[PDB]
């Protein structure tokens, strides 16, 4: 809707949070007010976050390459598990902390970089910088209850503050033997927190879950099947309706219920094995008291609603395919929508993904920084295809044979995409099976 | 949901478990409440389990490559077993302890190592570094009510902490031959026990069953069925309904009920053989006292809650086409959501893999810990297509020869690649068959 | 469903049983609460036993190879009657026992192995080493009525006692000709009683059928299917309904019932042609009383009914293709999902086998004792098809020519494969005709 040049408010940016807690639930299908209808959220995040898989570190600096290689090697699964926790929660932190903790369980490895996760409800606040809105300053809190290897329980309140100039962190309760007390310079001069962020809003502060969307819809689905459920409780089954000429008589005799009232109010059930046979008086009657359809027109109005939430999520049918069998026969023929929600759908993680590599660098000399992140395949190659355009490059070129030294470069950077494409398998995320293959060839030889 | 900056709780780690006992209950179709709802869980888990198959171990060194390899050949039914339990009960815990034990039925083994279950209420409490969360004790109780080998019953209530440093044992009953109680060091110095944990959260201590998305809505679906059954139990049999002039001497002349109040008393049954023929005078009507239907819009409802169910789930149609006939014409058109959905679940437990795998090589000098976790092929690749590609690898190379060394690099990978997948039996899981070839072909030569 | 860490009883064994009388009955189709619904029973078990085949025992050494391969060869029939005893009855035991024995009809086998079933009821106790639950002896006991060669009949009620130290075996009644009462020591010092566990759990002391799950199901569709047979037989046929001015005067005019409370009493039956003409007066009325349905929504409920059934015990459609004619259509579409189960369900088993073919090395000097077990073919490859693909890689080699030695290390192998699976046939479980083809061919050469 349109409005005047002027009657407008002055900008100001929105602090509002996710309400994780709740989120949460909705994935989980625990909350009590949407668990008919947040059905739909597990399928929506976990097809949104596994086909657009994990980002493939790529970096033309050799030794860069290696220790993006190691990370990816030992973190791919909590780099898929940010994805989920973005997706679901829209804010998702990872700390990424240096340990030179000796302990017998990893003596290949003296030290090592950490992939923690921040649970979002920990941030307590963020201080910004007005100027870039670039983090000065994380707020972490929390209630640790630990027992003790004793017979002791413990409590401990510990809040932290994380900045580029040290961390302080101050605790009530019972002490945490792994916790120092007081501020601790940081070793380096930048925050090692990545805020990755949903649906990253230049009015919003945080980010926004993929359920946010749904979730009216979700509820109004609950409210509707709910709704079904009890009406079709209360009137599916038909109820036989006895016109007789003493009504108290009938009971008592046929089924000794000498006292109807007493026997309505104790909510007693009169017992009924289904052959049963009436024989009535002239005046008495015997009809069925039964529903055309005790649910109505609640069907179409949750098609109605199922439509909305594929609609506002944009999931391809075939994530759906159980309510709409047309698309579990022509899922290659959706995938072209699915890789374009996905190609969407990377954008926003992707400069996360490039400060986390850049920050995972700095913490362990290099002649870049700077990483470009592939991806998983939405849509794999057959690797039968990939070759025989392999050959058609290859007998097209060594003819016309003016075209100069542009044919060796276009083949070996052929080959080069090739053979990681070839490498890469296509049920396993990541490329840490590729970098497994060129270590094992590099010691075999 | 949105929510204002503040206004929220403190974090807190929420250390509630997933009542095994029910689960399990609920995958062998045994709960009372849910019997006839939970005829879902089975295919759901079993499904998932078997298309994710078991972990294959890969490293670089060739002596840890054996080690393992000798694990997975004794081990691979535990392993897949790991993950039906993970799925069923959310928790799975495996304790791996060596035994010199000498028996005369394993001669060739003077030495062992054991893939022992924890059964996970068996895991009183886990105590954890609450900064790390590393677990640093596992508080173990169970009730052993044994028979001795003469005629004594026995009992006793064992306890024990396993912890880093050592493990603590005592019992309360019935002493034990194979137990010594008192603490004992252990002979290395982390905890040998892996809690595998399905749908890891942050903020949960422990795992989650696949139950439990789906635990409302098959509580429903056994109320929908369960009231369903009941009321056409009751009412679809249409009753016979005769309006008769003198109701007490019809029933006392055709079928000798000479005191009708006394034979409903005692549940007496007129018994018909379904040829009557009804002789009646002018006043007296007989009529069918008939349902439309007695289950209305249940079968509705029904539906929509298998709906629900195979959304939550995120299984494919194909595992219910008995439900949807549709889903079972394009199985091949559906594995790659089955392959997405499990990408996503076996990244979940591949850190665990890993840790088992190390924990192993630990327990058995070795250039490299560093186990890295391959997987069984979801949607299998036919070798006739494998050995097509390399053909047309084989003839693209040898052509256009300034591409270089690397010719020989990209050649040499993909044989070993075809190898390892052409050995691999797509219906066996696991690569035990690989090894015993390997093993049988460097034996026979 | 969830709950708090603490509030659950301690962890105790289950030492439950299966009911084994009443599982054969329900897959004989003999109990007379389950006759209408047990017709489900067979083919699960019976698909799932003969889909899942027999073992193929491999190991290195040539000389246990030969042993375990005149094993199968005695014994294929009884290992598969193992897999069906197993899914059935939940339990199964296979006693191994050695018998120097001679008799004219075995002139050719001075010594002997015996595949001896033990019915799970003869197990009366297993008593278990509380450590490691491993057993350490078996409490066997049978009530043995038995004819003699003469007229006199024979009474005995033996048990035994089998442990690892010895087998001690006590009988009442009747002396048994050919059994020593007594301690006796094991010429070896294990148990040579192999448990074969369905679905083996770690908190069930013994195995669960493929029953189990589905026996509610299974009581829930004859119930509904007898209600609607009984319905049916009361109420199909419609009841002519004479509306008549007298009419014992009737009866006794037309069919000659002059007493008719003494012909209704005494059970005297009308007698009908079918073709007969109404004659009446103005006043007298003839109507059929009618059904519109006997049966009423009985059908929809069973065919729920089936569908929970199916989906429990995860049996292919096409298994049950009379119900789904579509099913029929795609058989070789539907099988990789009887592959994935018999997948999972191998594993099972595939540990007992292990243990079974050590025993038998052990009863019968090898450099190795660890058997592989391999499997029959769910989905047999054509052979053509393999064919294609050995020729497939036997040109994609011999180019390239700097691939090196590896060559040669896996085209033998691939050979090596190619003729096991070739030799084996599709239609006879085990490799028994690959046994006897390689003695021929070494024999007549």
Redesign the interface.
């Known amino acids: 809707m349109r409005m005047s040049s002027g009657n407008i408010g002055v900008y100001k940016l929105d602090?509002?949070?996710?309400?994780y807690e709740?989120a949460?639930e909705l994935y989980?299908?625990?909350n009590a007010n949407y668990?008919?209808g947040s059905?739909?959220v597990?399928?929506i995040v976990?097809?949104t976050?596994?086909?657009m898989?994990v980002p493939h570190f790529q970096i033309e600096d050799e030794e860069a390459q290696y220790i993006l290689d190691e990370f990816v090697?030992?973190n791919?699964?909590?780099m898929?598990?940010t994805h989920?926790?973005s997706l679901k929660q829209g804010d998702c932190y990872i700390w990424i902390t240096r340990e030179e903790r000796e302990?017998?369980?990893?003596?290949?490895?003296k030290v090592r970089l950490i992939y923690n996760?921040i649970?979002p409800?920990?941030v307590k606040?963020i201080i910004l910088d007005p100027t870039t809105k670039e983090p000065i300053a994380y707020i972490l809190?929390?209630?640790?209850?630990?027992?003790?290897?004793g017979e002791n329980k413990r409590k401990?309140?510990v809040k932290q503050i994380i900045t580029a100039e040290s961390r302080f962190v101050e605790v009530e309760g019972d002490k945490?033997?792994?916790?120092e007390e007081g501020e601790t310079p940081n070793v380096w001069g930048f925050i090692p927190i990545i805020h990755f962020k949903n649906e990253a809003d230049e009015t919003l502060?945080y980010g926004q879950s993929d359920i946010?969307p749904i979730?009216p819809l979700l509820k109004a689905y609950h409210d509707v099947?709910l709704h079904?459920?009890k009406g079709?409780?209360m009137?599916?089954?038909?109820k036989?309706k006895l016109k007789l000429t003493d009504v108290a008589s009938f009971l008592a005799?046929?089924?000794?219920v000498e006292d109807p009232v007493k026997f309505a109010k104790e909510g007693g059930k009169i017992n009924?094995?289904?052959?049963?046979?009436?024989?009535?008086?002239?005046d008495?009657?015997?009809?069925?008291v039964?529903?055309?359809?005790?649910?109505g027109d609640a069907?179409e109005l949750?098609k109605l609603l199922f439509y909305c939430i594929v609609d506002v999520s944009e999931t391809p049918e075939?994530?759906?395919?159980?309510?709409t069998?047309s698309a579990?026969?022509?899922?290659?023929e959706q995938?072209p929508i699915m890789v374009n929600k996905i190609r969407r759908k990377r954008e926003q993680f992707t400069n996360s993904w490039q400060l986390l590599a850049r920050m995972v660098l700095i913490m362990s000399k290099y002649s870049s920084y700077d990483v470009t992140i592939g991806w998983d395949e939405v849509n794999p190659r057959?690797?039968?295809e990939?070759?025989?355009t392999?050959?058609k490059v290859?007998?097209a070129?060594?003819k016309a044979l003016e075209g100069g030294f542009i044919?060796?470069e276009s083949?070996?950077n052929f080959?080069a995409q090739?053979?990681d494409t070839?490498?890469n398998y296509?049920?396993?995320?990541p490329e840490?099976?590729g970098?497994?293959?060129k270590?094992?060839?590099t010691?075999?030889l």
């Not at 302990?103 to 490895?109: A, E, I, Q, R, S």
């Not at 009137?235 to 038909?238: F, G, L, N, V, Y």
């Not at 009924?272 to 002239?282: C, M, R, S």
């Not at 579990?328 to 290659?332: F, G, M, N, P």
């Open positions: 602090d509002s949070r996710v309400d709740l949460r989980q299908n625990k668990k008919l059905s739909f597990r399928p976990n097809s976050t596994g086909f898989g090697l030992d791919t699964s909590k898929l598990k989920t926790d302990n017998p369980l990893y003596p290949d490895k996760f649970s409800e920990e606040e809190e929390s209630q640790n209850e630990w027992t003790d290897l401990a309140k945490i033997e792994g916790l502060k946010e979730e099947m079904a459920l079709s409780k009137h599916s089954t038909p036989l005799h046929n089924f000794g009924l094995d289904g052959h049963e046979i009436l024989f009535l008086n002239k008495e009657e015997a009809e069925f039964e529903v055309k359809s005790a649910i069907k949750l075939f994530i759906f395919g159980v309510h069998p579990l026969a022509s899922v290659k995938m057959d690797d039968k990939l070759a025989e392999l050959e290859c007998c070129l060594d044919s060796e083949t070996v080959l090739y053979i070839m490498s296509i049920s396993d995320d840490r099976e970098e497994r293959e270590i094992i060839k010691k075999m």
